[PDB]
mmCIF file of N, CA and C and ligand atoms in Angstrom:
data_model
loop_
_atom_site.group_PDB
_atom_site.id
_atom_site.type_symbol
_atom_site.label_atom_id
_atom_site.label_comp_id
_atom_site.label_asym_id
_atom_site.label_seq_id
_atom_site.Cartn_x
_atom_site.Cartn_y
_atom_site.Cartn_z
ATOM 1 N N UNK A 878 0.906 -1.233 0.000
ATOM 2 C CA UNK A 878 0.000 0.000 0.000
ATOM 3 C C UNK A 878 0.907 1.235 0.000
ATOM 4 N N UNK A 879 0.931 2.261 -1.070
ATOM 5 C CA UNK A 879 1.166 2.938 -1.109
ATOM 6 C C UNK A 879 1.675 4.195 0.051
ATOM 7 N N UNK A 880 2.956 4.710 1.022
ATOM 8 C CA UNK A 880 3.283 5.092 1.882
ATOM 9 C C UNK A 880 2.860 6.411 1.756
ATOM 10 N N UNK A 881 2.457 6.942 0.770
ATOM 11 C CA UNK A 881 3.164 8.891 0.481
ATOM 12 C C UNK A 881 1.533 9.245 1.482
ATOM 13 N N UNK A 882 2.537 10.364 1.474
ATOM 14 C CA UNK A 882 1.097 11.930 2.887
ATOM 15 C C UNK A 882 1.368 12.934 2.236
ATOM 16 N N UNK A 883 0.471 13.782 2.378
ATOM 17 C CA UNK A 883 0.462 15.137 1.624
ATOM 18 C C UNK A 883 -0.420 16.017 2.587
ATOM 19 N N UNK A 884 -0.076 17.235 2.054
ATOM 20 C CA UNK A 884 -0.397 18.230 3.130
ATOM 21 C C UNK A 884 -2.020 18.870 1.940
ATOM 22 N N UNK A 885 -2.374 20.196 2.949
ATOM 23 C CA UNK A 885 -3.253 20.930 2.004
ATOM 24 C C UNK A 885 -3.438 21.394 1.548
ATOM 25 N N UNK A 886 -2.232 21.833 1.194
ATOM 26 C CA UNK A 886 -1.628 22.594 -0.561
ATOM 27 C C UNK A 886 -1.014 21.716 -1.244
ATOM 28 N N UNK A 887 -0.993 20.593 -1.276
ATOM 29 C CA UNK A 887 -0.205 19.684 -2.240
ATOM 30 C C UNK A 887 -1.332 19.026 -3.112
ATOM 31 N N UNK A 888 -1.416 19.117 -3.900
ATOM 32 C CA UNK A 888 -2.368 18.176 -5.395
ATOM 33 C C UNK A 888 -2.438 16.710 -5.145
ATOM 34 N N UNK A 889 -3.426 16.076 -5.591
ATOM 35 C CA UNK A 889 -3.986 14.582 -5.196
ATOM 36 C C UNK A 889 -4.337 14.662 -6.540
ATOM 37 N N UNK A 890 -4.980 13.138 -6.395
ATOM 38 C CA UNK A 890 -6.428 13.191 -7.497
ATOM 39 C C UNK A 890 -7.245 12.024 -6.453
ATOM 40 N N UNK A 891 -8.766 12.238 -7.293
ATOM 41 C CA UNK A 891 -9.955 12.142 -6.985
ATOM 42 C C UNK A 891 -10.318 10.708 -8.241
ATOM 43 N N UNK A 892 -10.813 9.764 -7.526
ATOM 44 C CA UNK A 892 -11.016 8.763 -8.932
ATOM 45 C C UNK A 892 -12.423 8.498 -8.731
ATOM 46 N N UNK A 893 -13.663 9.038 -8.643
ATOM 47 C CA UNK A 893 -15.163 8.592 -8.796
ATOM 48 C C UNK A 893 -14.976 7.197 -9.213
ATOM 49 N N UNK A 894 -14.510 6.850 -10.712
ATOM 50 C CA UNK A 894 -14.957 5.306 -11.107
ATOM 51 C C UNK A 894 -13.925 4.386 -10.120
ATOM 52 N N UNK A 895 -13.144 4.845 -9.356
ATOM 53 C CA UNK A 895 -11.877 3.479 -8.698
ATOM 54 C C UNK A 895 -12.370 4.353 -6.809
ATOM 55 N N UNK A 896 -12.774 4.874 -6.844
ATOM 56 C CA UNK A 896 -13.136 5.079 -5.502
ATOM 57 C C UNK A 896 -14.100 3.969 -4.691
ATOM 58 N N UNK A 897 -13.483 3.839 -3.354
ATOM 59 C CA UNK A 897 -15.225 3.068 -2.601
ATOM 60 C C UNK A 897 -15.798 4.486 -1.515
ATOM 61 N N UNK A 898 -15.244 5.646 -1.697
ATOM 62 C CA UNK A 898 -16.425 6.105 -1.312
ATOM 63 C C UNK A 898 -15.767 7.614 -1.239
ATOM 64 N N UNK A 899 -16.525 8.696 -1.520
ATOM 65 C CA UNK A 899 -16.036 10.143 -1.942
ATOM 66 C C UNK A 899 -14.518 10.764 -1.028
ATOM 67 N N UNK A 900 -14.092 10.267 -0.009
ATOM 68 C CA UNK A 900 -13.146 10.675 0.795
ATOM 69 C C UNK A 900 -11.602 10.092 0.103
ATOM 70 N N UNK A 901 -11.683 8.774 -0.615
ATOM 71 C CA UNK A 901 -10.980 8.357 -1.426
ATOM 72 C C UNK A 901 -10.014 9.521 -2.269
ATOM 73 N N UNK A 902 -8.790 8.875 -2.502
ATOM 74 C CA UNK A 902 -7.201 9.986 -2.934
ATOM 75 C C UNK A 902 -6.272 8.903 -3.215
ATOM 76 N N UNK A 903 -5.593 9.599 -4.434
ATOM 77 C CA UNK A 903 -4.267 8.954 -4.502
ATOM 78 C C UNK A 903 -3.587 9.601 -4.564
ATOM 79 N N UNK A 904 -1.963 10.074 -4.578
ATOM 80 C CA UNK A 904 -0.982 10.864 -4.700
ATOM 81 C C UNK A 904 -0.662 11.038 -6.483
ATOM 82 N N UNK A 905 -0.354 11.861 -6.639
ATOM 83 C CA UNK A 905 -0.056 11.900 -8.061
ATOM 84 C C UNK A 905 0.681 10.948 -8.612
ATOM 85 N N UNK A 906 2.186 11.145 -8.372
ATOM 86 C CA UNK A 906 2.881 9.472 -8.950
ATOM 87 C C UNK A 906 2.200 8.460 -8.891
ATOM 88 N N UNK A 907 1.046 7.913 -8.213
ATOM 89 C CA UNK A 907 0.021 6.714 -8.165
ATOM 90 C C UNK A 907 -0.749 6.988 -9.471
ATOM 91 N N UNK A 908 -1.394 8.283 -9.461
ATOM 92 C CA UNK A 908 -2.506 8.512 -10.417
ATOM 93 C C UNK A 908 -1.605 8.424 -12.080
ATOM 94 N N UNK A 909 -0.572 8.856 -12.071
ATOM 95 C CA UNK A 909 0.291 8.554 -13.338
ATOM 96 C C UNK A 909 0.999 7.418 -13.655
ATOM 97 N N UNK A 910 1.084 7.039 -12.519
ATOM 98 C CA UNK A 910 1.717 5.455 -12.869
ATOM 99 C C UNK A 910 0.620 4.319 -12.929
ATOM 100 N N UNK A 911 -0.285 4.654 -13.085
ATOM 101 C CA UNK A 911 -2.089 3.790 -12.885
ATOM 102 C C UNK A 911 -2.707 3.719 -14.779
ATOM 103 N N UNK A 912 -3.801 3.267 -14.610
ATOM 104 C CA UNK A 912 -4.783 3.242 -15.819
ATOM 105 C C UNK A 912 -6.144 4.066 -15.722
ATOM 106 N N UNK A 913 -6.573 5.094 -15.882
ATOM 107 C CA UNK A 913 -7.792 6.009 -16.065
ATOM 108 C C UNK A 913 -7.913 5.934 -16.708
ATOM 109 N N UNK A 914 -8.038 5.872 -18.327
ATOM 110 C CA UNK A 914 -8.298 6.643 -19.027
ATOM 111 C C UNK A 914 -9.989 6.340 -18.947
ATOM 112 N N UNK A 915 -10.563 7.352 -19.695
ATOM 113 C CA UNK A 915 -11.964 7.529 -19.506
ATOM 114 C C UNK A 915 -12.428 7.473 -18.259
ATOM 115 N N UNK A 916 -11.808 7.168 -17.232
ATOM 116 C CA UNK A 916 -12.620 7.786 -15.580
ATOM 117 C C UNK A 916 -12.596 9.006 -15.321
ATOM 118 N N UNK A 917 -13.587 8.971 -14.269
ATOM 119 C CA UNK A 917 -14.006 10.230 -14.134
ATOM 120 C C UNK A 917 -12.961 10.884 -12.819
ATOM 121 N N UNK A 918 -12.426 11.380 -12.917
ATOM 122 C CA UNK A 918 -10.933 11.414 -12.094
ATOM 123 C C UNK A 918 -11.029 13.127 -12.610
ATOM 124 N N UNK A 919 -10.657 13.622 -11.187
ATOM 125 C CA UNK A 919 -10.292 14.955 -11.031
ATOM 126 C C UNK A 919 -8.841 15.389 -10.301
ATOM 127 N N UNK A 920 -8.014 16.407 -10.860
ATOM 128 C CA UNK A 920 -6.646 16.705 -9.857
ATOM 129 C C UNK A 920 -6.876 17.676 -9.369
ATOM 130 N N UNK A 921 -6.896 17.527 -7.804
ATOM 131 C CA UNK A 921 -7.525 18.693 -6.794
ATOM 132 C C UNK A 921 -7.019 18.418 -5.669
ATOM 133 N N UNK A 922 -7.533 19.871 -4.443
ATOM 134 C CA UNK A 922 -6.703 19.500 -3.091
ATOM 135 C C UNK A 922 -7.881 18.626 -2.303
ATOM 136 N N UNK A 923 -7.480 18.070 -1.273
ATOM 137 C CA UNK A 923 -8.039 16.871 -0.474
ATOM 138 C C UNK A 923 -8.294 17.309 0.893
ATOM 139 N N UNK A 924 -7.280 18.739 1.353
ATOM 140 C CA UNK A 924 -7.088 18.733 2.839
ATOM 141 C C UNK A 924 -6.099 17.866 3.207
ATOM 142 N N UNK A 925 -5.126 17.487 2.556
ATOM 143 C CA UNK A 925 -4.359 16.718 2.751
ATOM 144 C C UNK A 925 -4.786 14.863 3.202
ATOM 145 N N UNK A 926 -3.673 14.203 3.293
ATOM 146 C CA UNK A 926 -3.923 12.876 3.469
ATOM 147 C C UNK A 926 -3.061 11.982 3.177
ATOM 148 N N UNK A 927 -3.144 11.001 2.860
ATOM 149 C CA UNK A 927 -2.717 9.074 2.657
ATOM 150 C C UNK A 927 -3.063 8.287 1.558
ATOM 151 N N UNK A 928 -2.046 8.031 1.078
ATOM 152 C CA UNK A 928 -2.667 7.527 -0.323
ATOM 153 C C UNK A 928 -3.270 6.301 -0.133
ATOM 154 N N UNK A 929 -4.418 5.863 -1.009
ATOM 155 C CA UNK A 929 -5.330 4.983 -1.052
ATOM 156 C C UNK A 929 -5.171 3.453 -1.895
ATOM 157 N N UNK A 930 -4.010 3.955 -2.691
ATOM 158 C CA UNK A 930 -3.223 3.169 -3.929
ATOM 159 C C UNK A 930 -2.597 1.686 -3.096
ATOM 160 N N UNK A 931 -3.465 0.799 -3.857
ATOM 161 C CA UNK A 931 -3.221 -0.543 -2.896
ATOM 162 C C UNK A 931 -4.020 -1.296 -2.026
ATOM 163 N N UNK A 932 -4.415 -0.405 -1.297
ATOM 164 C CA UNK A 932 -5.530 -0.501 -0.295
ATOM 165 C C UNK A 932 -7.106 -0.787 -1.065
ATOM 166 N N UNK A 933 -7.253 -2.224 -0.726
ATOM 167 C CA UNK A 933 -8.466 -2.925 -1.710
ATOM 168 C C UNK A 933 -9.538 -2.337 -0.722
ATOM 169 N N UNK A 934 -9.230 -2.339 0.654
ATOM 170 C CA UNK A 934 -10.721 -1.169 1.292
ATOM 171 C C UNK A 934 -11.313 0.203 0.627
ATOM 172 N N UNK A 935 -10.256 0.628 -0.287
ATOM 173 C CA UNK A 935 -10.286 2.364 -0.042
ATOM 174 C C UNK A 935 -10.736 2.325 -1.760
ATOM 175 N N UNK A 936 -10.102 1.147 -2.539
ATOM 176 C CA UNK A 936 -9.567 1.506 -3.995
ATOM 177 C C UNK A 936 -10.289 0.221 -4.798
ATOM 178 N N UNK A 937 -10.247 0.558 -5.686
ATOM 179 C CA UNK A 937 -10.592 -0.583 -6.555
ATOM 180 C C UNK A 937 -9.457 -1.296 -6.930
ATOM 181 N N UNK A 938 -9.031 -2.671 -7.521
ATOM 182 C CA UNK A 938 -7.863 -3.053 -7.817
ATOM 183 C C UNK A 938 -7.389 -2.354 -9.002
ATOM 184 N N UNK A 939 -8.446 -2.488 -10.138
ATOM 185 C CA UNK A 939 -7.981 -1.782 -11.862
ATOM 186 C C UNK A 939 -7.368 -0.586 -11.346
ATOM 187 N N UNK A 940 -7.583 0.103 -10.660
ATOM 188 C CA UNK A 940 -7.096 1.338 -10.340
ATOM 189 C C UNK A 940 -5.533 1.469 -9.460
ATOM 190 N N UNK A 941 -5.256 0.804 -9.155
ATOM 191 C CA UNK A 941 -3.863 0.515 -8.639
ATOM 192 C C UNK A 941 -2.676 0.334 -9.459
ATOM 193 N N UNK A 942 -1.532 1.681 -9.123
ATOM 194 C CA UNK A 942 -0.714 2.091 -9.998
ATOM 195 C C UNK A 942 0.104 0.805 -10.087
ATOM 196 N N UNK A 943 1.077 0.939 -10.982
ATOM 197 C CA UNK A 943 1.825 -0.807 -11.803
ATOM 198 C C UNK A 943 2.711 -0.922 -10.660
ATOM 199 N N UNK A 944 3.367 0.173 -9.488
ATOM 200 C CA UNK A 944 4.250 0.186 -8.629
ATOM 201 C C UNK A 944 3.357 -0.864 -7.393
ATOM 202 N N UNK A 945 2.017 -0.762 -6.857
ATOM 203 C CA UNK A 945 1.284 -1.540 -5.708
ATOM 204 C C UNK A 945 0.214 -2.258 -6.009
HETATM 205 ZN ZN1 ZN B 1004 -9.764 5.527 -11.842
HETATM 206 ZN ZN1 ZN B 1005 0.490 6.822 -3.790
HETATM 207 ZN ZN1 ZN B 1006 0.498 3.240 -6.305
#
């Protein structure tokens, strides 16, 4: 599972189709090293946080970057 934290000026993204539920985030290097295309995925702030990348509670598997 993905280690990285981010504060609340640092950029995330948002994955609606790989999310289990709106509080869901991944760190950018996750979201670029992953498969979206055509999801509905936004790059925005979070309030900071924990990446979700890996974590089959938080994430969907398709959505898990090629690194976790
Ligand atoms: Zn996605
Ligand atoms: Zn990550
Ligand atoms: Zn990852």
């Amino acid at each position: 599972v993905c280690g990285s934290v981010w504060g609340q000026n640092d950029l995330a993204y948002r994955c609606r189709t790989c999310e289990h539920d709106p509080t869901c985030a991944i760190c950018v290097p996750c979201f670029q090293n992953g498969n979206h295309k055509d999801h509905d995925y936004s790059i925005m702030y979070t309030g900071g946080g924990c990446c979700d990348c890996g974590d089959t509670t938080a994430w969907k598997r398709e959505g898990f970057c090629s690194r976790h």
